Design a protein around this ligand. Structure first.
Ligand SMILES: CC1=C(O)/C(=C\N=C(/CCCNC(=N)N)C(=O)O)C(COP(=O)(O)O)=CN1
Ligand SMILES: CC1=C(O)/C(=C\N=C(/CCCNC(=N)N)C(=O)O)C(COP(=O)(O)O)=CN1
Lengths: 365, 366
């Protein structure tokens, strides 16, 4: 038996109310056939930004939809190349973001996540360290679950202040932002109000695929500041005319379903696995790194005098447990990741607990 | 009342047997959910290349799957940019191919479709006119329905001979190739056998979204020659890890359904609309251009001393009929396209017939 705890894609099963969505897939199909594409785009975008509490995005009504967040990222990549912009990119970060931008020949330079830990040091650290015209953040971050929302509004406000002051393009990947929702202290505020009010040049990417168990039948959203909107619109329309109205109709049901249960069916699965990993590996050579935000991945430091993350990945995979070593997140210098391991949490809790038992057995040598 | 005959996306409704696929979407969901991603990739790729009769592609087993043909095209674009290659691209052709490659800063130079009309002139015409390192064809072509398959095997064989002899990367978009299938004289042969045997450097793109009424819940396929396979694999993997196994499972049922009826439910709808347009517009200012292949779009020349395609589009859209001016297909020189109009055929026949009656009414006023 193999245990894939590697990719962060959703592989948990449907909740009871989500099984009701599955049951009406035929009607969702025939509805999308009879209705207008624009209707399903509007209903999806409205449901999404109502759940995420981003009302400014619905007033501006300039958001464009694509097959996946990486496709939105490639549209951003075309804009970066057209404007001769290099990117300072968050590190650590899931390295496919580096890979796709590097494959588009965007020059890329790291900035360590620790620059954002102290709210009163964010602005001077960016002034000293950001030497490109574009800054690309992932918030909450993958793999660490870090979020500027630890600082309330002020963390994002300081980043936006820096980028506006210095005429930088601010790109933000909000794929994990659903995991802040309904949190008493961390629930995201209206980011588009801040982005619009500041006049900063920006590209904001949102996603459905990591939140819901939709088997990667998904939709991503990109929103651009008004000054670049037309250029980005034309870039986007060269990639695709439309996302499937069937998929949009289906995703709208998942979004509405999660508004009704305040994301309980998502949060409860991740919590069960996060807590199982924490308890099972407490005191082991894999040291759990508590995240700011309860995201769908768990991050561990290797605590051993000799073994590295490469060793831990090898030993676990030999027994059928597949995790990702940190080389896949320190994209500018993979050797820096040899002290870390990431595990995916969007999984069925039974398989996950069996994987945790086997993992502890292996680590106990 | 609006009649969208512009984009070529499939908007016809489901056949009786396709309705049985829609009715089983819950079952197809749970299959993919409990199953392995690689299972649904393999079963889809097998069904697809069985229907298209491309057995070599299944032996090589190196084809990669993406959300849509434009995404596969952007992977090819990343390869073209990494190698710093200029492209000679077929003209006319749907200009989104030009747009996405131009937006990736790929240099693009046109070659007219007519270089392929005479099989014994293909090679010398390419030697004169292809002065870049890459050649990008669309076969069958959009909007004209032209295909090298009018020449049997020999048209493609001459193109491949040229590209091999002169060290050209050959890119081919096969998205309209389903419309050749089961044709007595035009059915595509195994293209991958020729591409592999020749040793030519190539990128080949296949599609589902224009064939079946799957509401753009679709999948495209890209296959590279062995010498560039690893590079292209790494480029492709940076774009996506996987296509939805639910979508793959669903699409596999459409492919199998059309194997069972020899694509009749697709062909008959397109033929009904093609014939309606031909009969309705016979003798009008829109001169039907008979295609080599019965593709899902119809192409017309504007036969008038003053009126352009832009004028025709304006007049028709004022009464709610939306066609495309040919400017959107002469991407190197859009004015050339003001002599042509394209109409989408993948449409419910009753809507299409009403659109045709209104179209001739509008045209009969000028
Ligand atoms: C915060 C974030 C992610 O974590 C993420 C994806 N996570 C991944 C890649 C898996 C490998 N991806 C690949 N090979 N192309 C992960 O396991 O963390 C993406 C991209 O989303 P799409 O793949 O385009 O749907 C965007 N923002
Ligand atoms: C031969 C061919 C096509 O005709 C075609 C698409 N036809 C179109 C563009 C519609 C507009 N597309 C856009 N704005 N991106 C048409 O109406 O002919 C595509 C690309 O397919 P995807 O859109 O990625 O699914 C590839 N090969």
């Amino acid at each position: 038996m193999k245990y894939n705890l590697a990719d962060a894609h959703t592989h948990q099963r449907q909740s009871a109310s989500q099984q009701s969505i599955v049951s009406r897939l035929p009607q969702l199909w025939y509805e999308a056939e009879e209705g207008l594409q624009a209707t399903y785009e509007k209903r999806f975008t409205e449901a999404f930004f109502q759940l995420h509490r981003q009302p400014t995005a619905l007033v501006k009504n300039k958001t464009m939809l694509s097959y996946a967040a990486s496709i939105s990222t490639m549209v951003a990549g075309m804009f970066l190349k057209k404007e001769r912009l290099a990117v300072t990119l968050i590190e650590p970060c899931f390295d496919n973001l580096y890979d796709v931008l590097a494959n588009m020949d965007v020059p890329l330079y790291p900035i360590d996540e620790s620059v954002f830990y102290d709210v009163d040091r964010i602005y001077p650290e960016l002034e000293r360290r950001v030497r490109t015209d574009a800054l690309f953040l992932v918030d909450p971050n993958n793999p660490t679950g870090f979020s500027l929302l630890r600082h309330g509004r002020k963390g994002f406000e300081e980043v936006v202040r820096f980028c506006k002051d210095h005429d930088k393009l601010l790109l933000i990947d909000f794929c994990f932002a659903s995991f802040t929702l309904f949190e008493p202290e961390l629930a995201r505020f209206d980011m588009y109000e801040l982005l619009e009010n500041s006049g900063v040049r920006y590209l904001a990417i949102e996603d459905t695929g990591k939140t819901w168990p939709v088997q990667d039948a998904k939709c991503a959203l990109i929103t651009a500041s008004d000054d670049i909107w037309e250029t980005v619109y034309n870039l986007h329309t060269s990639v695709l005319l439309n996302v499937s109205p069937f998929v949009l109709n289906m995703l709208t049901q998942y979004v509405r379903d999660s508004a009704a249960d305040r994301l309980a069916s998502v949060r409860e699965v991740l919590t069960r696995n996060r807590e199982c990993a924490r308890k099972t590996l407490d005191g082991s050579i894999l040291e759990y790194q508590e995240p700011v935000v309860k995201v769908s991945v768990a991050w561990f430091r290797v605590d051993h005098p000799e073994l590295t993350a490469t060793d831990v990945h090898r030993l676990l995979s030999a027994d059928g447990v597949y995790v990702l070593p940190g080389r896949y997140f320190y994209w500018s210098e993979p050797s820096k990741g040899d002290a870390y391991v990431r595990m995916a949490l969007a999984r069925e809790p039974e398989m996950f607990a069996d994987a945790m038992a086997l993992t502890r057995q292996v680590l106990d040598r």
